[PDB]
């Protein structure tokens, strides 16, 4: 019995238009703000799915992906593959509070 099923919305996908050949391959996780064109940087982070384009313009479709850094020594409550909800606890960090 399947607990959670996600549906990838079409509006949740972003399309990015650029006039030069990018530096990407399908399968790389990218952080927003870094270089795609000299002078142009993409505004929202995420993973690239497919590249469409030939000539003087490129169509770069996206899927939104927000990264989260974990500290060495953190207790992980979940692994990769299962699905999380909004506000769902994933990790526990150890720290010193003043």
């Amino acid at each position: 019995s399947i607990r959670r099923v996600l549906l990838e919305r079409a509006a949740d996908r972003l399309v990015v238009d650029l006039p030069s050949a990018p530096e990407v391959k399908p399968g790389q996780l990218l952080v927003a703000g870094q270089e795609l064109v000299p002078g142009v940087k993409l505004e929202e982070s995420g993973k690239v799915l497919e590249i469409n384009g030939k000539g003087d313009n490129y169509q770069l479709v996206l899927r939104r992906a927000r990264p989260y850094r974990v500290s060495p020594g953190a207790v992980l409550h979940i692994e990769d593959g299962d699905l999380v909800q909004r506000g769902d606890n994933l990790v526990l960090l150890v720290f010193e509070r003043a």
Side-chain angles (χ1 to χ4, degrees), residues 1-7 9-40 42-48 51-53 55 57-84 87-98:
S1 295
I2 296 96
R3 312 255 182 85
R4 292 179 178 176
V5 177
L6 71 92
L7 183 65
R9 283 184 178 193
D12 280 359
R13 286 183 173 182
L14 292 175
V15 283
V16 175
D17 291 88
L18 68 157
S20 65
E23 300 91 5
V24 311
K25 66 100 177 177
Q28 195 66 30
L29 301 171
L30 295 177
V31 165
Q34 64 93 31
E35 189 268 331
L36 281 163
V37 195
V40 181
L42 79 163
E43 294 157 280
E44 186 57 55
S45 65
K47 186 180 181 179
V48 57
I51 179 168
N52 295 54
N57 50 0
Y58 282 72
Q59 187 255 8
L60 264 288
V61 68
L62 293 183
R63 186 187 188 188
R64 304 173 193 168
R66 203 193 309 195
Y68 295 95
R69 197 183 172 96
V70 292
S71 65
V75 170
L76 289 94
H77 307 274
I78 198 150
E79 66 268 13
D80 45 21
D82 38 0
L83 328 175
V84 295
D88 172 81
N89 52 277
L90 64 155
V91 291
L92 190 147
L93 271 69
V94 289
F95 82 113
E96 270 175 340
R97 173 171 284 271

